[PDB]
mmCIF file with all atom_site columns, C-alpha atoms in Angstrom:
data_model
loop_
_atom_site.group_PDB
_atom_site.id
_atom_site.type_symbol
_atom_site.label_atom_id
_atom_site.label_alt_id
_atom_site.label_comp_id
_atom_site.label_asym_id
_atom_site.label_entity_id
_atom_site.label_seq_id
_atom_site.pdbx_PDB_ins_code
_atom_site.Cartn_x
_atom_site.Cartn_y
_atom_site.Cartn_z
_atom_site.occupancy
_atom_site.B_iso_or_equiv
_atom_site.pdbx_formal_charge
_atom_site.auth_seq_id
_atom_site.auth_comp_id
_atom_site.auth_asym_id
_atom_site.auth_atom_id
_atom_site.pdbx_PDB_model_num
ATOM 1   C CA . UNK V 1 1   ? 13.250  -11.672 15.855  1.00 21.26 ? 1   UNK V CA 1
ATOM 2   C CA . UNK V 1 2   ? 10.113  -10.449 17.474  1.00 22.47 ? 2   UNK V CA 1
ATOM 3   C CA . UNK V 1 3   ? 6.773   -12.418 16.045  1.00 25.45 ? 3   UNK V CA 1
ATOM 4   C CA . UNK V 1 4   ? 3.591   -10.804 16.955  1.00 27.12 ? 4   UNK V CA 1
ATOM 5   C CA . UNK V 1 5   ? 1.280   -12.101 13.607  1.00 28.11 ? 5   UNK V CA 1
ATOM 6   C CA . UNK V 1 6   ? 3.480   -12.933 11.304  1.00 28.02 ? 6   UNK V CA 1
ATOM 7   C CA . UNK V 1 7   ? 4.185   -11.566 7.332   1.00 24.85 ? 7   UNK V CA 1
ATOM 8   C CA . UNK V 1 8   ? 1.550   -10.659 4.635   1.00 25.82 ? 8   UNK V CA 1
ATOM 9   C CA . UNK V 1 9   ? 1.982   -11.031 0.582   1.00 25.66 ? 9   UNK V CA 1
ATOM 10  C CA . UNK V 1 10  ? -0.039  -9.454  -1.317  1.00 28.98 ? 10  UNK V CA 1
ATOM 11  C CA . UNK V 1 11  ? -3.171  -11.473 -2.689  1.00 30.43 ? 11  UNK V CA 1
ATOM 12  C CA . UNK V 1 12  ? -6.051  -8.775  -3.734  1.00 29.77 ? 12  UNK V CA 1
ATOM 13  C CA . UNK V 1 13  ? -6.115  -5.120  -4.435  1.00 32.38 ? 13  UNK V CA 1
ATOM 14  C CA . UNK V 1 14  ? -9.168  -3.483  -4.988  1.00 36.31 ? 14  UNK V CA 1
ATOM 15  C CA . UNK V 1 15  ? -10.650 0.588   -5.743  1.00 36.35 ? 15  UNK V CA 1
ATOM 16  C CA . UNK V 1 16  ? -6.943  1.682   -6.506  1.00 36.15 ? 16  UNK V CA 1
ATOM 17  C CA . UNK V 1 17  ? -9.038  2.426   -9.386  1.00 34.95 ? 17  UNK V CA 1
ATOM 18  C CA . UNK V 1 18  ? -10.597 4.988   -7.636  1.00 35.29 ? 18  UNK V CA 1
ATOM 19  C CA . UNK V 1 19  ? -7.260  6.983   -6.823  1.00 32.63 ? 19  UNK V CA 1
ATOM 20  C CA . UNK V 1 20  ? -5.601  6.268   -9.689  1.00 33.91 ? 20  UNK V CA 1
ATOM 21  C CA . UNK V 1 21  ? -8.811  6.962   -11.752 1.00 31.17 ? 21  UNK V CA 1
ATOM 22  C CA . UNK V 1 22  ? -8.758  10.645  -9.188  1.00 30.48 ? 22  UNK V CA 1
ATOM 23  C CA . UNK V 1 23  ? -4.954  10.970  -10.450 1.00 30.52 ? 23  UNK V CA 1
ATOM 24  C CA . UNK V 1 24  ? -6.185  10.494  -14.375 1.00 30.55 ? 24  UNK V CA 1
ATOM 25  C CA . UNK V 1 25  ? -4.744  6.753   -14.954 1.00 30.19 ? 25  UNK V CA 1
ATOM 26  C CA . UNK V 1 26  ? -6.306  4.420   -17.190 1.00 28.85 ? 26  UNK V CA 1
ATOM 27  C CA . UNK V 1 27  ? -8.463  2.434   -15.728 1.00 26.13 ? 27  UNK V CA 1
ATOM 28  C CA . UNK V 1 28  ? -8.085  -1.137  -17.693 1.00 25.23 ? 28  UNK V CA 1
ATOM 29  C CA . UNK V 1 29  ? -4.593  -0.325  -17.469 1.00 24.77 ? 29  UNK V CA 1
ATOM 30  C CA . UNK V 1 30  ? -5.059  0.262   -13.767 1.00 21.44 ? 30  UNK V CA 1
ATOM 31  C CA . UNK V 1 31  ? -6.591  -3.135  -12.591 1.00 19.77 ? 31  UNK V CA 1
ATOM 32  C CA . UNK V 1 32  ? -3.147  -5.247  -14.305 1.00 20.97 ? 32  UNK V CA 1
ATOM 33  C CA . UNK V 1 33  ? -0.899  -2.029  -12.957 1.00 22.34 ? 33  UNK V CA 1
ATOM 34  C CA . UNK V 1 34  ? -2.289  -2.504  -9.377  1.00 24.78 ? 34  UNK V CA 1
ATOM 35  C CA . UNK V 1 35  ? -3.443  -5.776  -10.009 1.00 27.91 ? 35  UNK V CA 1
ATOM 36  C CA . UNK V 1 36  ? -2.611  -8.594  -7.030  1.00 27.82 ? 36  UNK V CA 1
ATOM 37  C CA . UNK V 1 37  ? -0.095  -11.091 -8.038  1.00 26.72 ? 37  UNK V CA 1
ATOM 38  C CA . UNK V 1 38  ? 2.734   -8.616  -7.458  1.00 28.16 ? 38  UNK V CA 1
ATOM 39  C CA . UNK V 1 39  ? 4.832   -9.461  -4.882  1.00 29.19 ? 39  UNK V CA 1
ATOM 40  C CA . UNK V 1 40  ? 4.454   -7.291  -1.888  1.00 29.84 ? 40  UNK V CA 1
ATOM 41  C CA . UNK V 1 41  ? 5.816   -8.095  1.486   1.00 31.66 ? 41  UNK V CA 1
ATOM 42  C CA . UNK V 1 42  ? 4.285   -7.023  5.124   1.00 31.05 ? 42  UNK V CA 1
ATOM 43  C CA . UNK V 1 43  ? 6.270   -7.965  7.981   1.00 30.66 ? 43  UNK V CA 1
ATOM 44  C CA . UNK V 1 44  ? 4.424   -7.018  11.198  1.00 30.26 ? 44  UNK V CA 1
ATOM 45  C CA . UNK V 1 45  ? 6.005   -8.014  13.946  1.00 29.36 ? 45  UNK V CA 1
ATOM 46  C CA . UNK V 1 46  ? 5.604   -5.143  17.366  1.00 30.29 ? 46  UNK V CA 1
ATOM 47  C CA . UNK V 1 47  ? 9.305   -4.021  17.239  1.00 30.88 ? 47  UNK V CA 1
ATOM 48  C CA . UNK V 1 48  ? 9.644   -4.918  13.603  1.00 31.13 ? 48  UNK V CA 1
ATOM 49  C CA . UNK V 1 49  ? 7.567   -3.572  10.771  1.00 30.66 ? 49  UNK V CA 1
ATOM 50  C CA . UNK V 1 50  ? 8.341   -3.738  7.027   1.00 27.45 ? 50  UNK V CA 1
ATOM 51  C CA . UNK V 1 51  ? 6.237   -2.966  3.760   1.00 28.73 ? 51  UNK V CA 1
ATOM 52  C CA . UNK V 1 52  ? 7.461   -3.343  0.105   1.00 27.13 ? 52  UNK V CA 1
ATOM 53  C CA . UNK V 1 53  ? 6.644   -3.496  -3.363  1.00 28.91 ? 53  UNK V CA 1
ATOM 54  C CA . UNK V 1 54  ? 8.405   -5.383  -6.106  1.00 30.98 ? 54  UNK V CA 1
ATOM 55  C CA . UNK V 1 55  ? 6.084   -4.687  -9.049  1.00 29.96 ? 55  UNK V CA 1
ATOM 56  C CA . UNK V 1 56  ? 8.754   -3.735  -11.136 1.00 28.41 ? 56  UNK V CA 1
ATOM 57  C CA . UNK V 1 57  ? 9.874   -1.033  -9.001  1.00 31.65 ? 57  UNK V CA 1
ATOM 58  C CA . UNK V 1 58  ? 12.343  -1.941  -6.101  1.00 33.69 ? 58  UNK V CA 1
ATOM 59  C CA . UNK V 1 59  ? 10.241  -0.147  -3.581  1.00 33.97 ? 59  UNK V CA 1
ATOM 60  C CA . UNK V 1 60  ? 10.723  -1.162  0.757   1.00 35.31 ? 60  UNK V CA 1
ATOM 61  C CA . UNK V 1 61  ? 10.151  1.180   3.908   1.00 36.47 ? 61  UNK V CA 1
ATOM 62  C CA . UNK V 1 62  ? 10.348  0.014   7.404   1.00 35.52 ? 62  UNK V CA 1
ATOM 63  C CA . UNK V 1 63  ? 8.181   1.135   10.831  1.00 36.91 ? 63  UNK V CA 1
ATOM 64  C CA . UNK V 1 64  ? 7.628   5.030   10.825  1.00 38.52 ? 64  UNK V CA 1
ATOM 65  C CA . UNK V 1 65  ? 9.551   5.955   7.238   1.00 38.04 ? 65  UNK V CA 1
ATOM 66  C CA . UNK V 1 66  ? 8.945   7.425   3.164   1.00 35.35 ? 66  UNK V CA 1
ATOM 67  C CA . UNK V 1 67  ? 9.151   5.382   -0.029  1.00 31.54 ? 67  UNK V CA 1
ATOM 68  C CA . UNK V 1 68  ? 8.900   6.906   -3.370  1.00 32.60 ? 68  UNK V CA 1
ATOM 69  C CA . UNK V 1 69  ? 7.585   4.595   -6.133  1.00 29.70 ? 69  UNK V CA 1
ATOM 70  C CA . UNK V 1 70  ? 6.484   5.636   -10.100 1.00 27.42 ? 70  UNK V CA 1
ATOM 71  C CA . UNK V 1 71  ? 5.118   2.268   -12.000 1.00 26.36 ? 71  UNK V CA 1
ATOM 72  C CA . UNK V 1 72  ? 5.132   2.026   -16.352 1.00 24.49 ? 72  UNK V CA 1
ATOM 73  C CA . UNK V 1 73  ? 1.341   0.074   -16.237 1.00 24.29 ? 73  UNK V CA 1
ATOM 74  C CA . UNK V 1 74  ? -0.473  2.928   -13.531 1.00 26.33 ? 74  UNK V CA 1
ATOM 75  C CA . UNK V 1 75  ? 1.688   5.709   -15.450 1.00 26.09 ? 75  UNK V CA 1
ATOM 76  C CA . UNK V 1 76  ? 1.454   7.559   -11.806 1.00 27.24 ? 76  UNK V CA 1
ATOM 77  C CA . UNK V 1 77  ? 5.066   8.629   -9.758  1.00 25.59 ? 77  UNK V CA 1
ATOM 78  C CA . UNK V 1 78  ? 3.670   9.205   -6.423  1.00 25.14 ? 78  UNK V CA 1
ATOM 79  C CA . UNK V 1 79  ? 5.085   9.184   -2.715  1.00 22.00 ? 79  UNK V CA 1
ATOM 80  C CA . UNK V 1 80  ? 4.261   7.710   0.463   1.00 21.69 ? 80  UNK V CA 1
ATOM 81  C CA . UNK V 1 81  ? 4.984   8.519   4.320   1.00 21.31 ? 81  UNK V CA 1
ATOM 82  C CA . UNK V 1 82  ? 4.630   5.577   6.853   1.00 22.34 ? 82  UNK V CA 1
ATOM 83  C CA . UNK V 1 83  ? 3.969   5.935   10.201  1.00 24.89 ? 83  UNK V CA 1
ATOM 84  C CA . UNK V 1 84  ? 3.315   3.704   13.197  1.00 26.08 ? 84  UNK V CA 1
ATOM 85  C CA . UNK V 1 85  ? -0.287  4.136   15.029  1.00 26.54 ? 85  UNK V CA 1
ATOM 86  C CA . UNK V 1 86  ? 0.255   1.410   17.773  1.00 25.41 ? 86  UNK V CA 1
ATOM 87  C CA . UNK V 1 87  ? -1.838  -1.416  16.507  1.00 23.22 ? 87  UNK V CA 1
ATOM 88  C CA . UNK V 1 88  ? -2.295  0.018   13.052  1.00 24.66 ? 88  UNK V CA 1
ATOM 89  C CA . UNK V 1 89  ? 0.281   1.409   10.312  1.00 22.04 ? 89  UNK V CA 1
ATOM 90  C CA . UNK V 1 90  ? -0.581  4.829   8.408   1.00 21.00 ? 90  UNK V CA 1
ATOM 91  C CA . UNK V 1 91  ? 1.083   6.046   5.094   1.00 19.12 ? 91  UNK V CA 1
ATOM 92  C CA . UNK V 1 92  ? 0.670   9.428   3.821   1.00 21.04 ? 92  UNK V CA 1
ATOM 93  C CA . UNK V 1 93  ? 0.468   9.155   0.113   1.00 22.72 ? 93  UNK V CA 1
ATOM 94  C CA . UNK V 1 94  ? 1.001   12.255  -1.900  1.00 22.00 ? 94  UNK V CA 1
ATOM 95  C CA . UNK V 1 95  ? -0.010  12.245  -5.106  1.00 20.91 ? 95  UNK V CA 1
ATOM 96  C CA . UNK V 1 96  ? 1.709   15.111  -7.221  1.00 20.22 ? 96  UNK V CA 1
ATOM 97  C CA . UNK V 1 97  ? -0.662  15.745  -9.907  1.00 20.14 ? 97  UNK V CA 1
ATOM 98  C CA . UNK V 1 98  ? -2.564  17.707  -7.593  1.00 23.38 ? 98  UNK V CA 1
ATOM 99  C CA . UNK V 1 99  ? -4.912  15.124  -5.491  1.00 22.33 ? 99  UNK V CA 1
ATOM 100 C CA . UNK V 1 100 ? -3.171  14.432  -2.513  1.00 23.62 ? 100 UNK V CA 1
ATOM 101 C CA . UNK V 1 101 ? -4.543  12.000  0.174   1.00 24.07 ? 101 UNK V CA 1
ATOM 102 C CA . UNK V 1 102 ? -3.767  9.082   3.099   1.00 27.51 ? 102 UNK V CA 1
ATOM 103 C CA . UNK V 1 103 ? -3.477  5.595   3.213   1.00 27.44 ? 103 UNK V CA 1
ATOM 104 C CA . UNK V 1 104 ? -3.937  3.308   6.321   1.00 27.72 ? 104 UNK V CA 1
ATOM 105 C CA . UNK V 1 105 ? -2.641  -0.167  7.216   1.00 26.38 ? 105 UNK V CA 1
ATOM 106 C CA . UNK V 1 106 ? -4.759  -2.096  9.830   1.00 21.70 ? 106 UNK V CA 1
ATOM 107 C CA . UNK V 1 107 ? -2.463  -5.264  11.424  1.00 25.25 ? 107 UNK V CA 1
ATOM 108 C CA . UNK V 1 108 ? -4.380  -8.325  10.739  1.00 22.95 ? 108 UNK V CA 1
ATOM 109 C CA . UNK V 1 109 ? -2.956  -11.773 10.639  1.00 21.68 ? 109 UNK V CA 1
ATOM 110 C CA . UNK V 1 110 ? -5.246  -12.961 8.288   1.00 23.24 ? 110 UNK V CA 1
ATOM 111 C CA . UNK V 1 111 ? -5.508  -10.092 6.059   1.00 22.77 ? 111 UNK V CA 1
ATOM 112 C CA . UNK V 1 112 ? -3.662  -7.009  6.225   1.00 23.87 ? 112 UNK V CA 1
ATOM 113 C CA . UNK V 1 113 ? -5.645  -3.688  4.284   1.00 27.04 ? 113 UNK V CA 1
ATOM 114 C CA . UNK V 1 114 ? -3.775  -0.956  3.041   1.00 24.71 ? 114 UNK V CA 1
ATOM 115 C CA . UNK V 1 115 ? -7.112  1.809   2.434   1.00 27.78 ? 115 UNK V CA 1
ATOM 116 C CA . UNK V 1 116 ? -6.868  5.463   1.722   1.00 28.90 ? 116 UNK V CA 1
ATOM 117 C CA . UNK V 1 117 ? -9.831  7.725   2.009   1.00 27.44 ? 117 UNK V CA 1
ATOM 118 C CA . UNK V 1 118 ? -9.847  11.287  0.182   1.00 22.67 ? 118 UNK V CA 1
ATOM 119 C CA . UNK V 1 119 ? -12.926 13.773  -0.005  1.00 24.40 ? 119 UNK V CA 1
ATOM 120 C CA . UNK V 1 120 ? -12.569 13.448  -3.735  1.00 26.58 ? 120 UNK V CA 1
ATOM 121 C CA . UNK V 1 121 ? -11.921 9.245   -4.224  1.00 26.87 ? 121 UNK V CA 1
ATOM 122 C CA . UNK V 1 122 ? -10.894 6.331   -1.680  1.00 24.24 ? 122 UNK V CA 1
ATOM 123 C CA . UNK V 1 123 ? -8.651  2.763   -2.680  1.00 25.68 ? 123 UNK V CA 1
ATOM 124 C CA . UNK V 1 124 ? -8.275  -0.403  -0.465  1.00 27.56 ? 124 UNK V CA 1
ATOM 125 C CA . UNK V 1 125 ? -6.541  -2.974  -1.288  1.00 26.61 ? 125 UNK V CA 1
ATOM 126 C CA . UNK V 1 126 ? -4.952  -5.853  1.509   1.00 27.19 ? 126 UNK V CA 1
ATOM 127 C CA . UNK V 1 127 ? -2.108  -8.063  1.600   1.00 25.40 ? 127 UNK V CA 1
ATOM 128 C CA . UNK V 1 128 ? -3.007  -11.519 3.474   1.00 25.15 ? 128 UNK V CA 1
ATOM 129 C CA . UNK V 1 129 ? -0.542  -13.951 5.162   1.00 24.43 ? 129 UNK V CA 1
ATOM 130 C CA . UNK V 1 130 ? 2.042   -16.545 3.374   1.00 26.50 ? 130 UNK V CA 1
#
């Protein structure tokens, strides 16, 4: 019901490369795995938030949750921990193979960006309105 800036498909991912590259995924493999095009969907909202994936997997969270997701083209089974920083979203990914890390989720109308910055490998990647 609340509308605060609207909801956000994605439209480009970029440098989940660099994580999944981190986590040992292929990296041609990588950029059609976490390649835009898949359907995402970013509600934001104030007192309504909602992120999901539909890649393949059947993967949606809502304001201050988890979400477990494993994809066949990354060949990576990871999880991830939202929470709500006021005027930004956070998510906590783990990444079992050893190099955990966490994502963040700036609220943009024009452009959502999901980034994650580790001390061994970052990814960005942002999911813009409609």
């Amino acid at each position: 019901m609340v509308q605060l800036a609207g909801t956000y498909k994605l439209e480009k991912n970029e440098n989940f490369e660099e994580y999944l590259a981190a986590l040992g995924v292929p990296q041609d493999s990588i950029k059609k795995a976490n390649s835009p095009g898949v359907v995402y969907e970013i509600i934001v909202n104030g007192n309504k938030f909602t992120f999901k994936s539909s890649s393949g997997m059947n993967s949606t969270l809502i304001v201050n949750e988890e979400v477990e997701e494993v994809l066949g083209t990354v060949n990576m089974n990871i999880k991830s921990f939202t929470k709500l920083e006021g005027s930004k979203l956070v998510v906590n990914s783990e990444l079992p193979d050893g190099r955990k890390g966490t994502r963040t989720y700036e609220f943009c109308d024009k452009g959502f960006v999901l980034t994650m910055c580790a001390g061994d490998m970052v990814a960005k990647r942002y999911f813009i309105r409609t």
